[PDB]
Amino acid sequence: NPCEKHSCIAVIDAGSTGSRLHIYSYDTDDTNTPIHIEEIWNKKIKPGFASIQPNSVTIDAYLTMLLADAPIHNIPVYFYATAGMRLLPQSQQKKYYDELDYWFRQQSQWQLVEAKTITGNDEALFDWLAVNYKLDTLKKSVGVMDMGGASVQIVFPMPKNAEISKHNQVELNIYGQNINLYVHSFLGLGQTEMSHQFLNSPSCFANDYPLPDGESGQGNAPSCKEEVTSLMNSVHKVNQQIQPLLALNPVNEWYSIGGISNLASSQLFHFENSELTNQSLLQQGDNQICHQQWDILNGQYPDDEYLYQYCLLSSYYYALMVDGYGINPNQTIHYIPPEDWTIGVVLHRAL
Amino acid sequence: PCEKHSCIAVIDAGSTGSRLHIYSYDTDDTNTPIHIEEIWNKKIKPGFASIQPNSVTIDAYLTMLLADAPIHNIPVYFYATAGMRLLPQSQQKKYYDELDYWFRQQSQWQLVEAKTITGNDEALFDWLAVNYKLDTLKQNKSVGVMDMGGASVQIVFPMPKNAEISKHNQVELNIYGQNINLYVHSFLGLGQTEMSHQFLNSPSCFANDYPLPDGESGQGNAPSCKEEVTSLMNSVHKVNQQIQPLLALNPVNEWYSIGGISNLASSQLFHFENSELTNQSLLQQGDNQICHQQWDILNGQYPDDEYLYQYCLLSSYYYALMVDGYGINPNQTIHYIPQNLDWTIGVVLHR
Structure with missing residues (x-):
């Protein structure tokens, strides 16, 4: 298992046609900066997060699908939505993030660092x-x-x-x-x-x-x-x-x-x-x-x-x-x- | 209502949602509808062009729109507008083939035609x-x-x-x-x-x-x-x-x-x-x-x-x-x- 011999992190690209989860293993040089970044996992689900109904059932079911089968647990996760989400009003965006926040708090296997529209x-x-x-x-x-x-x-x-x-x-x-x-x-x-x-x-x-x-x-x-x-x-x-x-x-x-x-x-x-x-x-x-x-x-x-x-x-x-x-x-x-x-x-x- | 008058259903498959309307009307010398009256109205979200183009999804969406109505054996026009126009023809075909299938397994609704206007x-x-x-x-x-x-x-x-x-x-x-x-x-x-x-x-x-x-x-x-x-x-x-x-x-x-x-x-x-x-x-x-x-x-x-x-x-x-x-x-x-x-x-x- 890579993450027994290296630091690991998940980054979710919550893009316009779907969400893509990346898990990378890495070392750090003298300054605690990542080196030897290698992607060890990569799954995309469809459609975009901004195109699903904004409630607990739909969102819970969405995240569960994206993340249930990932081969490593107990690592930091970033969930970053891009332009598809920027198109919705802040008030609509908040509904997505408040449910997503609640889902991630009920699980013990992911450690969410931030979930936001960058x-x-x-x-x-x-x-x-x-x-x-x-x-x-x-x-x-x-x-x-x-x-x-x-x-x-x-x-x-x-x-x-x-x-x-x-x-x-x-x-x-x-x-x-x-x-x-x-x-x-x-x-x-x-x-x-x-x-x-x-x-x-x-x-x-x-x-x-x-x-x-x-x-x-x-x-x-x-x-x-x-x-x-x-x-x-x-x-x-x-x-x-x-x-x-x-x-x-x-x-x-x-x-x-x-x-x-x-x-x-x-x-x-x-x-x-x-x-x-x-x-x-x-x-x-x-x-x-x-x-x-x-x-x-x-x-x-x-x-x-x-x-x-x-x-x-x-x-x-x-x-x-x-x-x-x-x-x-x-x-x-x-x-x-893009692949x-x-x-x-x-x-x-790490800067 | 529809044995005292002749009637029809129109589906407005709009950009933001789909709207089913059932009309009762009569006719005159020129055989043109008069006393057009909307007897049933059902609205669902999102737009048809916005749901996932697969059989399970298109199936449930249609069922949710149509299986409700308290009427039996009625002609229906399915007109998709601007949201569908946004999609290339090759992208539209899957929606309409899935639609043909759905209608073919029941006889409540007699589909007249389904088309992107x-x-x-x-x-x-x-x-x-x-x-x-x-x-x-x-x-x-x-x-x-x-x-x-x-x-x-x-x-x-x-x-x-x-x-x-x-x-x-x-x-x-x-x-x-x-x-x-x-x-x-x-x-x-x-x-x-x-x-x-x-x-x-x-x-x-x-x-x-x-x-x-x-x-x-x-x-x-x-x-x-x-x-x-x-x-x-x-x-x-x-x-x-x-x-x-x-x-x-x-x-x-x-x-x-x-x-x-x-x-x-x-x-x-x-x-x-x-x-x-x-x-x-x-x-x-x-x-x-x-x-x-x-x-x-x-x-x-x-x-x-x-x-x-x-x-x-x-x-x-x-x-x-x-x-x-x-x-x-x-x-x-x-x-x-x-x-x-x-x-x-x-x-x-x-x-």
């Missing part, structure tokens, strides 16, 4: 730490983009300044050294939530795709991008808030976690070495989905669940990274598959 | 429903209906056939002798719940000190929140460019509105008389009652109101949609329905 900024911080641990780069400026179901996050080094809001900035000391980060999160710009604004725009789907209200897809990536861009800059003002900061704090290497990898390593996009550029992404989306005829394209992939959405998503990614953030179309973006960020919680609690 | 068909039943209740179908004056939904919004009014406009935005039918032609439009994504997800971190849209999901505080101000909502209206959806020129050519002689507006207008916080409002008075009251009020105080003052937190946002949004979007005079009267009336009576009629 802010996207905190989410950003855990993303950055997880990736930098993973790349063995915690001793060049590293940037992280996390593309989620309901929100997206961006994080990268920036010296502290009092002109920029306190919630958008973090300082920490890490394996001996002082790192200041800018954290941002855009609620509503996740792929799932943004997409609900564009389901009727012909330019975002393959030719003759039947759109929800009866019109036909007439796919064109450049055009769909500009539509997505209207939402990013006119509404959320991504460009105005992010671009001038990147202009003063250039990033050396970009890592994207979350949904981009699902698209990138689909049967429909082709990249090598887990790297893309937005130029190639938009061009591939344009030629390989947007200008394809839906009948024929569905004909080759009649059993694939998000193919239909790939003209819009390639267009969205470009809009966000290039028109929002102001990353050069030719700048390499590395990507990690992670909860490694960031293991790390942050 | 368009926002345009929705907008047709809306308009039928209002005018049936108003007794204006059996012309002289021009009634329009705006339907304020969870995920989408509908607007509908009379307009003579035009070959420039897509067939999908135009409905033609003969009723009680006279033919009628209607413009129908639906904005998927601009319904109340979906649009809210883009503005949750907007201080201008919330009561002073409301805790925004990101950690900043509400600092209420209606005009300002309204302008923000207006960017989603026009810069993203192009409502003004689509609707205003038409209305200008085909003026509406009276405005009705069903859905979320009625709940708001008839809440404790807003004062309206005679089942009518104006946008100028809505946005002033919103700004006065909510936006410019302290949150804790107002929260403590209305313990039973779980929508209250978004009344600053909702009043600014309704004004953005009706005034900056549609073009309606801030001083113009809008009738709201306060509730023996549902859009599903329009399904009874339309056949």
